[PDB]
Amino acid sequence: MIDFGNFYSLIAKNHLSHWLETLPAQIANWQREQQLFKQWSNAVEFLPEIKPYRLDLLHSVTAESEEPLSAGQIKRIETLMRNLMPWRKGPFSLYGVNIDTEWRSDWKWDRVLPHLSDLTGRTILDVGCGSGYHMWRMIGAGAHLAVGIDPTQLFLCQFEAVRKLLGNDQRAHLLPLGIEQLPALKAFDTVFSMGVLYHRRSPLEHLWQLKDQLVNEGELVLETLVIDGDENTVLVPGDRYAQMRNVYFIPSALALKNWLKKCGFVDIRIADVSVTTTEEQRRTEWMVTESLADFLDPHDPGKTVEGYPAPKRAVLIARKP
Ligand SMILES: Nc1ncnc2c1ncn2[C@@H]1O[C@H](C[S@+](CC[C@H]([NH3+])C(=O)[O-])CC(=O)[O-])[C@@H](O)[C@H]1O
C-alpha cells in the first residue's frame, strides 16, 4: 500500500485540520476495496529515492543529478516508469527519462498561468489532478501546498513515482478521493477544476462544491470542454463524445459564465478558449492506445467521429465573495 500518514500529520498542523474528521475513513475504505495493481505498486516501491541536485518546477518538471547517472540506472528507472503507462498528463523529465505524455499539459498551464492571482504562498486544491503534473507547476509558481484529488489507482501510483524521484517532496499530495466525497472545507486559497465539469451529472452542484472548498475571496479556476454560442447554447451528447463515455454538459463559455453567476461566483472572466489540436493530445511512446486523431471525423477535424463539434476548451476564472 501507500501510507497517508505524512499527509495527515501535515494537515493536523495547518488550516486543513478539520479534514481529519472524514479523510482517513474515506481513504481507509478506498484502500479496502482495492484488492494490474501489484505491477503499479512495485513500480513505485522499486524506483530509487533520489534527491534531485537540480529541480525546475517553474518552467517544466525537470530533475537532474549533479553527476549524470549510469546508462543502466536510467534504464531501470525508464522501465519501471514504463510499467505505469498510460502516461497522459505531463510531460516529466527525470534524470534523463523523458516522459512524453499524451497531453502537453504544459500548454494548458501556459494558457492558465497569466490569468491567475499570484500563487505564491497559497494553499491549493486541484480537483481531478491526474498524474499531478500541474501540482508540481503550482509548487514552481511558489504555492505553499498543493493538494490534489483523483480516485484512480494508476494516477496515485504515477504521482508517487514522481514524488519519490523528486526526493520525496512533501509540498504536494494526491488523495484518491472523488470530488463528491469532500465536505465544505472552505479552506483553499485557489481551486482548480480542469477537465472535470463535463464528467459530472450535476454541473451546477459541481460549481457549488468547488465554491465550498474556497475561503472568502478565494479564486476558482475552471477549465472544461465547451461549444461556440450565446448564453443559451449547451450541448448534451449521447453515449459518446470524442469516444468518451459519461460526458454530460458542454456549454458555451458564455453559458458557463452565467452558471457561475447562478452559483454565486463573482468577477467572472472568460480567459482562454482554444480548439484542442492533435499536437496538444496524441499517442506517444508513453501512451500507446487511441487518442484525439482517432476521435475526430477523418474527413473534417472540426467534428468528432460521432458528428459533434470538436473538442474546444475554455478557462474561466472567478472569485468567491
Ligand atoms: N469523481 C471525481 N472527482 C475528481 N476527479 C475525478 C472524478 N472522477 C474522475 N475524475 C478525474 O478527472 C480527471 C479528468 S482529466 C483532466 C486532468 C487535469 N485536471 C487536466 O486538466 O489535464 C481528462 C481531460 O479533460 O483531459 C481524470 O484524471 C479523472 O480520473
Residue numbers in the entry: 1 to 35, 38 to 323
The article reads:
Recently, we demonstrated that cmo5U modification requires the previously unknown metabolite carboxy-S-adenosine-L-methionine (Cx-SAM), which is generated by the CmoA-catalyzed conversion of prephenate and SAM to yield Cx-SAM and phenylpyruvate. Cx-SAM is subsequently utilized in the CmoB-catalyzed carboxymethylation of ho5U-containing tRNAs to yield the mature cmo5U-modified tRNAs, with no involvement of a mo5U intermediate. As predicted from sequence considerations, CmoB is composed of a Rossmann fold, coupled to a substrate-specific N-terminal domain of ∼100 residues that is unique to CmoB. Our biochemical, genetic and structural data demonstrate that the primary in vivo function of CmoB is as a carboxymethyl transferase in the biosynthesis of cmo5U-modified tRNAs.
Cx-SAM bound CmoB structures were determined in two crystal forms, resulting in 10 independent copies of the complex (two tetramers in one crystal form, and one dimer in the other), while the apo structure contains a single dimer in the asymmetric unit. The dimers exhibit symmetry-related interactions that recapitulate the expected tetramer. Continued refinement and modeling indicated that Cx-SAM is present at full occupancy and demonstrated similar atomic interactions in all 10 independent catalytic sites in both liganded structures. The side chains of Lys-91, Tyr-200 and Arg-315 interact with the carboxyl group of the S-carboxymethyl moiety of the Cx-SAM ligand. Three additional conserved residues within the CmoB family recognize the amino acid moiety of the ligand: the side chain of Lys-110 (815/818) forms polar interactions with the α-carboxy group, while the backbone carbonyl oxygen atoms of Gly-130 (817/818; the presence of a bulkier side chain would likely interfere with ligand binding) and Met-196 (606/818, where other instances are leucine) interact with the α-amino group of Cx-SAM. The side chain of Glu-182 (96% conservation) forms polar interactions with N6 of the adenine moiety and the side chain of Asp-152 (∼97% conserved in CmoB orthologs, and highly conserved in all members for SAM-dependent methyltransferase superfamily) interacts with the 2′- and 3′-hydroxyls. The side chain of Thr-154 (only 29.9% conservation) also forms a hydrogen bond with the 2′-hydroxyl of Cx-SAM. The Cx-SAM binding site is more exposed to solvent than observed for the Cx-SAM/SAM binding sites in CmoA and many other SAM-dependent methyltransferases, likely due to the need to accommodate bulky tRNA substrates. Considerable positive electrostatic potential surrounds the Cx-SAM binding pocket on the surface of the CmoB, consistent with the docking site of polyanionic tRNA molecules. In all subunits in both Cx-SAM bound structures, a feature modeled as a phosphate ion is present between two basic residues, Arg-202 and His-208 (98.3 and 67.1% conservation, respectively), with one of the presumed sulfate ions from the crystallization media present at a similar position in the apo structure.
